Amino acid sequence: TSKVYDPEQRKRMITGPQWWARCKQMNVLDSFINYYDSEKHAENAVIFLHGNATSSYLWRHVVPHIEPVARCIIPDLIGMGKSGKSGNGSYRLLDHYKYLTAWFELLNLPKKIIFVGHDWGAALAFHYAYEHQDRIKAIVHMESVVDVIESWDEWPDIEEAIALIKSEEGEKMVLENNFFVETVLPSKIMRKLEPEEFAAYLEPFKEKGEVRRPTLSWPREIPLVKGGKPDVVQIVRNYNAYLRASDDLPKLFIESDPGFFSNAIVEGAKKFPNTEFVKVKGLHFLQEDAPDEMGKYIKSFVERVLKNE
Ligand SMILES: O=C(Cc1ccc(O)cc1)Nc1ncc(-c2ccc(O)cc2)nc1Cc1ccccc1
């Protein structure tokens, strides 16, 4: 089987260098963060957080829909995109969180922030919200780390896939063979990326070896109650209980159609009160298949949240 280019895409395409040239850099702790900032309408701030394999580039066709209503800020997570590397060489959830919260202190943010999170980016937003419950205006999430995975909800294939990723063979398939960028990322986009679009995702990870570490460390954080990192399992338990009780926090969940092993994500999202549910085309990296539908849904949700405030 083969996937097909979107025959109109080369005409609104944004290449890697075009996106990076629009970004800014800021020293943060012992490193630096590369980020997009639309600047205008700073009375609000919408912070878009990518997850594994990607970067701020993931949001390039989503963010123009929301810029007219609020300042939009989109970082490359540490070790990813064009950001600096992690000073301690480590790329666990809490390492990412250290740089993200330090970076927030430098951004002149409003008291209450809107988060838009994908995959592990949503975990970062959820954990920030749990620790800063008075700083959250709304949360948009999609393909998100909503809850732990109990052992009776863990089937053998996911058990063995995580065993593989936690083994030396898993380390080599990522660091030497770039599994998550070269295979997982295009496999979970329904269209075929233009060569220049794929090159933007490849570029941070084009060389072999340790530079690819964040794309191995993220799946190793998976919150399997059986065998998963205990600190991450507790972080996710804590913010899941907070989200289940957060009746006054407006949320938007963007469901993928058909998604990819996403049923537990959708079911977990349904346990959070005050959630608007929408659906767009996609597998996992749904920004690449339905960015304008997503941007329109988020724009309408943000306008409704601001109007009702
Ligand atoms: O590792 C993750 C991240 C995650 C997302 C949501 C969540 O609640 C917990 C963790 N996801 C993942 N990671 C791996 C696989 C996977 C791997 C192998 C396989 O054969 C099938 C699925 N699937 C998934 C998606 C998934 C599965 C089960 C419960 C929730 C989310």
Coordinates of C-alpha atoms and ligand atoms in Angstrom, one line a residue:
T1 CA 0.0 0.0 0.0
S2 CA 1.0 3.6 -0.5
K3 CA -0.2 7.0 0.8
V4 CA -0.7 9.9 -1.6
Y5 CA 0.4 13.6 -1.4
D6 CA -2.3 16.2 -0.9
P7 CA -2.1 17.6 -4.5
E8 CA -2.7 21.2 -3.3
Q9 CA -0.2 21.1 -0.4
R10 CA 2.9 22.4 -2.1
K11 CA 1.2 25.7 -2.5
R12 CA 0.6 26.6 1.2
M13 CA 3.5 24.4 2.4
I14 CA 5.8 25.8 5.1
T15 CA 9.3 24.3 5.0
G16 CA 11.5 23.7 8.1
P17 CA 13.7 26.8 7.5
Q18 CA 10.7 29.0 6.9
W19 CA 9.2 28.0 10.2
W20 CA 12.5 28.2 12.2
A21 CA 13.2 31.7 10.8
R22 CA 9.9 32.9 12.4
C23 CA 10.9 31.5 15.8
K24 CA 12.7 33.2 18.7
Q25 CA 15.2 31.9 21.2
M26 CA 15.5 32.5 24.9
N27 CA 18.1 31.3 27.4
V28 CA 16.4 29.1 30.1
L29 CA 18.4 27.7 33.1
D30 CA 21.5 26.0 31.6
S31 CA 20.1 25.8 28.0
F32 CA 17.7 27.6 25.7
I33 CA 14.2 27.2 24.2
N34 CA 13.3 27.9 20.6
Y35 CA 9.7 29.0 20.2
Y36 CA 7.1 30.7 18.1
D37 CA 5.3 33.7 19.6
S38 CA 2.6 35.6 17.7
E39 CA 2.8 38.4 20.3
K40 CA -0.4 40.2 19.6
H41 CA -3.4 40.1 22.0
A42 CA -1.3 39.2 25.0
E43 CA -4.1 39.6 27.5
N44 CA -4.5 35.9 26.9
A45 CA -2.0 33.2 26.1
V46 CA -2.6 29.9 24.2
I47 CA 0.4 27.6 24.8
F48 CA 0.6 24.7 22.2
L49 CA 2.7 21.7 23.4
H50 CA 3.8 19.0 20.9
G51 CA 4.8 15.5 22.0
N52 CA 7.1 12.8 20.9
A53 CA 8.8 12.8 17.4
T54 CA 7.6 16.3 16.6
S55 CA 8.2 20.0 17.4
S56 CA 6.5 23.3 17.3
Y57 CA 6.4 22.8 13.5
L58 CA 3.5 20.4 14.1
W59 CA 1.2 23.4 14.8
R60 CA 2.3 25.6 11.9
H61 CA -1.1 25.4 10.0
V62 CA -3.2 25.3 13.2
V63 CA -1.9 28.4 14.9
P64 CA -2.9 31.0 12.3
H65 CA -6.6 30.3 13.1
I66 CA -6.1 31.3 16.7
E67 CA -3.6 34.2 16.5
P68 CA -6.4 36.8 15.9
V69 CA -8.0 36.1 19.3
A70 CA -5.0 35.4 21.6
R71 CA -1.3 35.4 21.8
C72 CA -0.1 32.0 20.7
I73 CA 3.2 30.6 22.1
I74 CA 4.6 27.3 20.8
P75 CA 7.9 25.9 22.2
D76 CA 10.2 23.2 20.9
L77 CA 10.5 21.0 24.0
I78 CA 14.1 20.6 25.3
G79 CA 16.2 18.4 23.1
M80 CA 13.6 18.6 20.3
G81 CA 13.1 20.9 17.3
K82 CA 15.7 23.8 17.4
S83 CA 15.8 24.0 21.2
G84 CA 18.9 23.5 23.3
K85 CA 19.7 20.2 24.9
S86 CA 19.0 19.1 28.4
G87 CA 21.8 20.1 30.8
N88 CA 21.8 16.9 32.7
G89 CA 21.5 14.8 29.6
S90 CA 18.1 13.4 30.6
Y91 CA 14.7 13.7 28.8
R92 CA 12.2 12.3 31.3
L93 CA 8.8 14.0 31.8
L94 CA 10.2 15.9 34.8
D95 CA 13.3 17.1 32.9
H96 CA 11.0 18.6 30.2
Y97 CA 8.8 20.1 32.9
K98 CA 11.8 21.8 34.6
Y99 CA 12.6 23.7 31.4
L100 CA 9.0 24.4 30.5
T101 CA 8.2 26.0 33.9
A102 CA 11.4 28.0 33.9
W103 CA 10.6 29.2 30.4
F104 CA 7.1 30.2 31.5
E105 CA 8.6 32.6 34.1
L106 CA 10.2 34.6 31.3
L107 CA 7.2 35.0 29.0
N108 CA 5.1 37.7 30.8
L109 CA 2.1 35.4 30.9
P110 CA -1.4 36.4 32.1
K111 CA -2.6 34.9 35.4
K112 CA -4.7 32.3 33.6
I113 CA -3.4 30.4 30.6
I114 CA -5.0 28.3 27.9
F115 CA -3.1 25.1 27.0
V116 CA -3.3 23.0 23.8
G117 CA -1.6 19.6 24.2
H118 CA -0.9 16.6 22.0
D119 CA 0.5 13.3 23.3
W120 CA 3.2 13.9 25.9
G121 CA 2.7 17.7 25.5
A122 CA -0.7 17.1 27.0
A123 CA 0.9 15.3 30.0
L124 CA 3.1 18.4 30.5
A125 CA 0.0 20.6 30.4
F126 CA -2.0 18.4 32.8
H127 CA 0.9 18.2 35.3
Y128 CA 1.4 22.0 35.1
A129 CA -2.4 22.5 35.7
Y130 CA -2.3 20.1 38.7
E131 CA 0.5 22.1 40.3
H132 CA -0.9 25.5 39.3
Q133 CA -4.6 25.1 39.6
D134 CA -5.3 28.9 39.7
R135 CA -3.4 29.6 36.5
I136 CA -5.6 27.6 34.0
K137 CA -8.3 29.2 31.9
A138 CA -9.0 26.1 29.7
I139 CA -7.3 23.0 28.3
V140 CA -7.5 21.6 24.7
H141 CA -6.2 18.1 24.4
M142 CA -5.9 15.4 21.8
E143 CA -4.2 12.0 21.5
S144 CA -3.3 12.7 25.1
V145 CA -1.8 10.9 28.1
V146 CA -5.1 11.1 30.1
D147 CA -4.6 8.3 32.7
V148 CA -2.5 5.4 33.8
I149 CA -2.8 2.0 32.2
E150 CA -3.8 -0.7 34.7
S151 CA -2.5 -4.2 34.3
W152 CA -5.9 -5.6 33.6
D153 CA -6.2 -3.0 30.8
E154 CA -2.8 -3.9 29.4
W155 CA -2.9 -6.6 26.6
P156 CA 0.2 -8.6 25.6
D157 CA 1.1 -6.7 22.5
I158 CA 1.5 -3.4 24.3
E159 CA 3.3 -5.2 27.1
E160 CA 5.8 -6.6 24.6
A161 CA 6.2 -3.4 22.7
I162 CA 7.1 -1.5 25.8
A163 CA 9.5 -4.4 26.8
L164 CA 11.1 -4.0 23.4
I165 CA 11.4 -0.2 23.7
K166 CA 12.9 -0.6 27.2
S167 CA 15.5 -3.1 25.9
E168 CA 18.8 -2.5 24.2
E169 CA 17.2 -3.5 20.9
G170 CA 14.7 -0.7 21.5
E171 CA 17.5 1.7 22.2
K172 CA 19.2 0.8 18.9
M173 CA 16.1 0.9 16.8
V174 CA 15.6 4.5 17.9
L175 CA 19.1 5.9 18.3
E176 CA 20.6 4.0 15.3
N177 CA 17.5 3.5 13.1
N178 CA 15.4 6.6 14.1
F179 CA 12.2 4.4 14.5
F180 CA 9.9 7.1 15.8
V181 CA 10.7 9.8 13.2
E182 CA 11.3 7.6 10.1
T183 CA 8.6 5.0 10.7
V184 CA 6.1 5.9 13.4
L185 CA 5.5 9.5 12.4
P186 CA 4.7 8.9 8.7
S187 CA 2.8 5.7 9.5
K188 CA 0.4 7.7 11.7
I189 CA -0.3 10.5 9.2
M190 CA -3.0 9.6 6.7
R191 CA -1.7 11.8 3.8
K192 CA 1.9 11.6 2.5
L193 CA 4.0 14.5 3.7
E194 CA 5.7 16.6 1.1
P195 CA 9.5 15.8 1.1
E196 CA 10.2 19.2 2.6
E197 CA 7.7 18.7 5.4
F198 CA 9.2 15.3 6.4
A199 CA 12.6 16.9 6.2
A200 CA 11.5 19.5 8.9
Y201 CA 10.7 16.6 11.2
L202 CA 13.9 14.7 10.3
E203 CA 16.3 17.6 10.7
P204 CA 16.8 17.7 14.5
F205 CA 17.3 13.9 14.4
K206 CA 19.1 13.5 11.1
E207 CA 22.4 12.3 12.7
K208 CA 22.7 8.9 14.3
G209 CA 23.0 8.4 18.0
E210 CA 22.4 10.3 21.2
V211 CA 20.7 13.3 19.5
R212 CA 17.7 11.0 19.1
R213 CA 17.5 10.4 22.9
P214 CA 14.2 12.3 23.5
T215 CA 12.3 10.1 21.1
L216 CA 13.4 7.0 23.1
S217 CA 12.9 8.6 26.5
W218 CA 9.3 9.6 25.9
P219 CA 7.8 6.1 25.3
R220 CA 9.9 4.8 28.2
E221 CA 7.8 7.1 30.5
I222 CA 4.6 5.3 29.6
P223 CA 2.4 5.1 32.8
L224 CA 1.9 1.4 33.0
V225 CA 1.0 0.7 36.6
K226 CA 2.7 -2.7 36.1
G227 CA 6.3 -1.9 35.4
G228 CA 6.1 1.8 34.5
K229 CA 8.2 4.6 36.0
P230 CA 6.7 5.0 39.5
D231 CA 7.2 8.8 39.5
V232 CA 5.3 9.2 36.2
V233 CA 2.5 6.8 37.3
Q234 CA 2.0 9.0 40.4
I235 CA 2.1 12.2 38.4
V236 CA -0.6 10.9 36.1
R237 CA -2.7 9.5 38.9
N238 CA -2.5 12.9 40.6
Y239 CA -3.5 15.0 37.6
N240 CA -6.1 12.5 36.5
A241 CA -8.0 12.8 39.8
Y242 CA -7.7 16.6 39.6
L243 CA -9.1 16.6 36.0
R244 CA -12.0 14.3 36.9
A245 CA -13.0 16.8 39.6
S246 CA -12.4 20.0 37.7
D247 CA -16.0 20.9 37.0
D248 CA -15.3 24.6 36.4
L249 CA -12.4 24.2 34.0
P250 CA -13.6 24.2 30.4
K251 CA -12.0 21.6 28.2
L252 CA -12.0 20.7 24.5
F253 CA -11.1 17.1 23.4
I254 CA -10.3 16.7 19.7
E255 CA -10.9 13.1 18.7
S256 CA -9.1 11.4 15.8
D257 CA -11.1 9.6 13.2
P258 CA -10.3 6.7 13.1
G259 CA -7.5 7.2 15.5
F260 CA -4.9 4.5 16.4
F261 CA -5.5 2.4 19.5
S262 CA -7.1 5.6 20.9
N263 CA -10.2 4.1 22.6
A264 CA -8.7 4.3 26.1
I265 CA -7.8 7.9 25.3
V266 CA -11.4 8.8 24.4
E267 CA -12.9 6.9 27.3
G268 CA -10.5 8.6 29.7
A269 CA -11.3 12.0 28.3
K270 CA -15.0 11.3 28.8
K271 CA -14.4 11.2 32.6
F272 CA -13.3 14.9 32.7
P273 CA -16.3 17.2 33.3
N274 CA -16.9 20.3 31.2
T275 CA -15.5 18.8 28.0
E276 CA -16.6 19.7 24.5
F277 CA -16.0 16.9 22.1
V278 CA -15.2 17.3 18.4
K279 CA -13.8 15.0 15.8
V280 CA -11.4 15.5 12.9
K281 CA -9.7 13.2 10.4
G282 CA -6.5 11.5 11.5
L283 CA -4.6 8.7 13.1
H284 CA -2.2 10.0 15.7
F285 CA -0.6 13.2 14.2
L286 CA -4.0 14.6 13.3
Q287 CA -2.5 18.1 12.9
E288 CA -1.1 16.9 9.5
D289 CA -4.5 15.6 8.2
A290 CA -7.0 18.2 9.5
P291 CA -5.1 21.4 10.7
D292 CA -7.8 23.9 9.5
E293 CA -10.7 22.0 11.0
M294 CA -8.7 21.7 14.2
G295 CA -7.8 25.4 14.2
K296 CA -11.4 26.4 13.6
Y297 CA -12.6 24.2 16.4
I298 CA -10.0 25.6 18.8
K299 CA -10.7 29.2 17.7
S300 CA -14.5 28.7 18.4
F301 CA -13.8 27.1 21.8
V302 CA -11.4 29.9 22.9
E303 CA -13.9 32.5 21.8
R304 CA -16.6 30.7 23.8
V305 CA -14.4 30.4 26.9
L306 CA -13.5 34.1 26.7
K307 CA -17.1 35.2 26.2
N308 CA -18.3 33.2 29.1
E309 CA -15.6 34.3 31.5
Ligands
LIG1 O1 2.3 5.3 25.4 C1 1.3 5.9 25.2 C2 1.1 7.2 25.8 C3 -0.2 7.2 26.6 C4 -1.4 7.8 26.1 C5 -2.6 7.8 26.9 C6 -2.6 7.2 28.1 O2 -3.8 7.1 28.8 C7 -1.5 6.5 28.6 C8 -0.3 6.5 27.8 N1 0.4 5.3 24.2 C9 0.5 4.0 23.6 N2 1.7 3.4 23.5 C10 1.8 2.2 22.9 C11 0.6 1.7 22.3 C12 0.6 0.3 21.6 C13 1.8 -0.4 21.4 C14 1.8 -1.6 20.8 C15 0.6 -2.1 20.3 O3 0.6 -3.4 19.6 C16 -0.5 -1.4 20.5 C17 -0.5 -0.2 21.1 N3 -0.6 2.3 22.4 C18 -0.6 3.5 23.0 C19 -2.0 4.2 23.1 C20 -2.7 3.7 24.4 C21 -2.8 2.4 24.7 C22 -3.4 2.0 25.9 C23 -4.0 2.9 26.7 C24 -3.9 4.2 26.4 C25 -3.3 4.7 25.3

